[PDB]
Design a protein around this ligand. Structure first.
Ligand SMILES: CC(=O)N[C@@H]1[C@@H](O)[C@H](O[C@@H]2O[C@H](CO)[C@@H](O[C@@H]3O[C@H](CO)[C@@H](O[C@@H]4O[C@H](CO)[C@@H](O)[C@H](O)[C@H]4NC(C)=O)[C@H](O)[C@H]3NC(C)=O)[C@H](O)[C@H]2NC(C)=O)[C@@H](CO)O[C@H]1O
Length: 129
């Protein structure tokens, strides 16, 4: 699909992301334009061999099943292809706890620099929520 700015962010407040688990609601909407550029069909493999999956930019190496990742943990226990479709209604149970493991957003790379030390509080702005 193709989400407009105000139209692909209000979905986090329908999934318990507003002020969830130590991160504020706004801290989130920013990286989205920084991970797949508001699109769920944007994916790539890596120089390390782990294939990424969706707007979320996840690797088949530590989190899901693509089967081409042997010794892959897959603690999520759901097909990697289970997130990329237009419907993402079940797509966050993993990204939800990916931070509870104690290292936070560190899994995400772009935010640590692209959204870190920024006016992240300035992306979620301009939309009613
Ligand atoms: C734009 C782009 O291309 N970015 C891609 C990333 O989105 C993508 O994701 C990140 O992949 C890296 C590896 O390439 C991954 O790094 C490690 O992740 C694990 C598990 O989540 C972390 O877990 C820690 O484990 C240690 C023991 O190993 C524990 O003691 C600690 O308590 C754990 N803490 C956490 C975070 O739970 C590691 O900490 C982390 N590496 C380091 C240096 O600590 C990220 O987690 C990935 N994040 C996401 C969102 O998937 C990557 C994969 O293909 O590709 C990038 O290109």
């Amino acid at each position: 699909k193709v989400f407009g700015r105000c139209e692909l962010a209000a979905a986090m407040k329908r999934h318990g992301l507003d002020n969830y688990r130590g991160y504020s609601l706004g801290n989130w909407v920013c990286a989205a334009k920084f991970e797949s550029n508001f699109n769920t069909q944007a994916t790539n493999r890596n120089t390390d061999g782990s294939t990424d999956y969706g707007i979320l930019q996840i690797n088949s190496r530590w989190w899901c099943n693509d089967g081409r990742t042997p010794g892959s943990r897959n603690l999520c226990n759901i097909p990697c292809s289970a997130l990329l479709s237009s419907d993402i209604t079940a797509s966050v149970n993993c990204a939800k706890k990916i931070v509870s493991d104690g290292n936070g957003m560190n899994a995400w790379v772009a935010w640590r620099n692209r959204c870190k030390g920024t006016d992240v509080q300035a992306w979620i702005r301009g939309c009613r929520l």
